[PDB]
């Protein structure tokens, strides 16, 4: 490609009646900066009208619209695709160049755009129009399942993906999608190894995708209290061997280092996890995983100032606003004034979208107790706050009574709520003691204002 | 540690009011994460820079990893580790004014560190959260490295 | 049918699964495996 | 088709719901909103301007739902504090506080007759409390996961319920029995409302599809592609010609109930919109959200 780029740089300056030179310019720049190809197509579109009045072939407008499809010019790319379809239809005599395939690919990109233009009805209609004329096509039949998969992972998605594999078992995308199906329900933890080892035959090798899927499904087995049984250490060693193997054959793969940092963090090296995650962050930090793995290291070293922002940034994406896992990772060792009262605000924001989780209903009570003990033990503070603390403690006690009746828990029984009840009892006693102090401060302020008013009367 | 600030930036405009001198130019850069302004002045002659280039600016109070708080003097004969080994442009200055949007009642929310590297100025304007390590009359460094990306 | 070979032979796939895995830059394992072995030697 | 009023910093904390009147009983001119700052602000939309009339407090936790009674100028507000407090827009005082303990308190549902108040229960049932009684009159025995949305029909003939797994439960408020169970969604239903004629039923699930079903024969009338994010709030125009849809992507699309086409979209909100509601005539469309700014959208 370097010699071709140099040759195009030579043909660009001079003007020996160049007609197709810009086409070759753009044909290489599609992998590189996407604006160079757009500039080349922009000039190539107008250079095809001086020699004769010849309409632009649909293949160039189709490729420029494809370039714009990845960009924010979705409507402009839509116009490009529609005009390409109109032009390709006019090719009644270009049976050798197969205008039909040009229309097929243009409509494929157009349906991909409509699926991306918040219009899945038109995307379904267009992909089905491709199906009705060419059932031997895979990508349309695979995107239709993705569309039905948004509503749920048990609808026609899980059926179309397997029918697509049954028609082409040597298609890595379809088989990987098959493995992707089992990821919604992780009950197939150990058993997904078999279905991920179907296309691990040497003919398909090497395939980094499936090997990293194995590494991920093997990492999921971690975070268990059975590590002392020499079981999770072997799992760490196996996943580390997988990551080393995919590192030797591919040193630039970021996920291998991601998993290596994950395991090293699991090994107790957080001081040494930042260095390994640094290369992954510097390569491309716009992946949802790194913002959290790094925020875990920051929140581990008593740096919530550098961890709350990382959790906020991961939520800046247009997919949700109040996720449960992010807020769960948000409150780890928060004890400061701006990290308890506000922590309640974010906890309520999280519980608003799905209150059925027990961990939220337990953490809200724990933070309520923390504030109450933080205002009813060593304070001697404002009075209205002593009035509000008893209400907060009563709500916490009601939630203590309610949480005990729930059957399932966070893979750990909550029978240890008794100490919380005793804590709240002595908090109630201390509150009934400190309300008298509140009244004493009330009479103090009253006599202070009186002894100031007398001086003002003197003046 | 001594890392008073750490963030990636990108060049977006050079000498908007016309290049006055011949070896120094204004770099009206912007951040990518903390969203902070930057008016750094680098020696364009020895360290050329064009628009769109990104660099890892790291204001550090010292050049040593252990952070021994050097007195401040040119001592090239030194075998101790130095943080400058992984930076292509380092400077040494002394912040002289920390302006902010303070009021009579509520604390400030956005500060503005004014540091002079012996004549080369730099305004690190932004929020008042990450500028806690800047105090008037204190020595600081720059430690910037251009990113190849 | 010919419609299959008619499209797969003229198209261009600039990005696929594996492309997403490697960084667009040059980050070798020399600066990675060094620490990966150093951590193992201390244990 | 644009924006008339722009209330900047309408609240200290994010607004999660908005209530505006439709009748002439001193409700269409007053806007009641409930936010997470424990401020039940009674805004009076007088002189075509959003002016504050009352500022009601007392809720321990943030307001989850606000609605105005159809045949009555009083209002009520619920929260997750299990203390559903009734209020009055005639005096800015509290009528009562239904202690829907211990945690069993969700969005409100004013009856069209303004005599019953439906509230979701964590056990999966739908408790129907009395407005002037406060005691649990009768509970619908349709268990499951949880009730995420409850809506009363304008003329009081049906009642639907949004579950956590896309389960519409068509009840009968005339007899208190489950008639149909529409399960055309697998996503948690956020909110829903009845058509002004009680013939169409829009469902705001978390799939981005506005699947408008029918209530008379419990069938789907057509799948409409909504936004890309989750549709939070949805309301019908009082004249029954269009319906707005609030999503989680800073987008206020006004979809057509007849042609299933977006007739206009607003992008004036910097954050996600949480509440959308019409005026008494359907021209002004009030909106709230995490931006904490009340926008009044005029569509003449």
Tab-separated table of C-alpha atoms in Angstrom, chain A residues 27 30-31 70 97-98 101 104 134 136 172-173 176 207-209 240 244 247-248 250-255 260 267 269 272 275 283, chain C residues 1-4 6-7 10-12 14-18 20-23 25-29 31-33 35-36 39-40 42-43:
chain	number	residue	atom	x	y	z
A	27	UNK	CA	-9.884	3.203	-2.394
A	30	UNK	CA	-11.042	3.901	3.512
A	31	UNK	CA	-8.967	2.062	6.117
A	70	UNK	CA	-20.239	5.563	9.992
A	97	UNK	CA	-21.288	-5.662	-13.824
A	98	UNK	CA	-24.397	-7.046	-12.058
A	101	UNK	CA	-25.585	-6.914	-6.656
A	104	UNK	CA	-28.383	-5.449	-3.012
A	134	UNK	CA	-31.674	-14.201	-2.067
A	136	UNK	CA	-28.366	-17.636	0.569
A	172	UNK	CA	-17.149	-17.619	12.248
A	173	UNK	CA	-19.565	-14.726	12.800
A	176	UNK	CA	-19.637	-16.680	17.593
A	207	UNK	CA	-9.013	-17.313	15.994
A	208	UNK	CA	-8.387	-14.768	18.749
A	209	UNK	CA	-12.126	-14.147	19.211
A	240	UNK	CA	-3.132	-16.492	32.492
A	244	UNK	CA	0.026	-15.457	27.450
A	247	UNK	CA	-0.173	-12.434	23.693
A	248	UNK	CA	2.737	-14.260	22.038
A	250	UNK	CA	-0.608	-11.132	19.009
A	251	UNK	CA	1.224	-8.543	21.108
A	252	UNK	CA	-1.114	-5.703	20.075
A	253	UNK	CA	-4.326	-7.337	21.334
A	254	UNK	CA	-5.655	-5.150	24.149
A	255	UNK	CA	-8.078	-7.660	25.686
A	260	UNK	CA	-3.952	-10.084	32.614
A	267	UNK	CA	-3.883	-11.741	42.776
A	269	UNK	CA	-1.458	-6.485	42.952
A	272	UNK	CA	0.979	-3.161	39.934
A	275	UNK	CA	0.887	-0.148	35.089
A	283	UNK	CA	-4.345	2.531	23.312
C	1	UNK	CA	-26.479	-19.271	-6.784
C	2	UNK	CA	-24.185	-16.735	-8.447
C	3	UNK	CA	-25.514	-13.846	-6.323
C	4	UNK	CA	-23.244	-15.027	-3.492
C	6	UNK	CA	-21.234	-11.847	-7.188
C	7	UNK	CA	-21.050	-9.770	-3.984
C	10	UNK	CA	-16.352	-7.037	-5.189
C	11	UNK	CA	-16.976	-5.837	-1.620
C	12	UNK	CA	-14.334	-4.794	0.912
C	14	UNK	CA	-12.042	-3.003	6.339
C	15	UNK	CA	-12.951	-4.065	9.894
C	16	UNK	CA	-13.923	-7.402	11.432
C	17	UNK	CA	-13.878	-9.040	14.862
C	18	UNK	CA	-10.114	-9.477	15.152
C	20	UNK	CA	-11.308	-4.627	17.052
C	21	UNK	CA	-8.990	-6.664	19.287
C	22	UNK	CA	-5.642	-5.154	18.260
C	23	UNK	CA	-4.981	-1.494	18.957
C	25	UNK	CA	-1.215	1.718	17.223
C	26	UNK	CA	1.960	-0.250	17.919
C	27	UNK	CA	1.901	-1.686	21.455
C	28	UNK	CA	4.134	-4.760	21.593
C	29	UNK	CA	4.549	-7.197	24.491
C	31	UNK	CA	6.721	-3.557	27.881
C	32	UNK	CA	4.030	-6.039	29.010
C	33	UNK	CA	5.704	-9.423	29.379
C	35	UNK	CA	6.278	-6.888	34.226
C	36	UNK	CA	4.387	-10.151	33.689
C	39	UNK	CA	5.626	-10.247	39.149
C	40	UNK	CA	6.183	-14.003	38.855
C	42	UNK	CA	8.955	-12.093	43.248
C	43	UNK	CA	6.440	-14.816	44.173
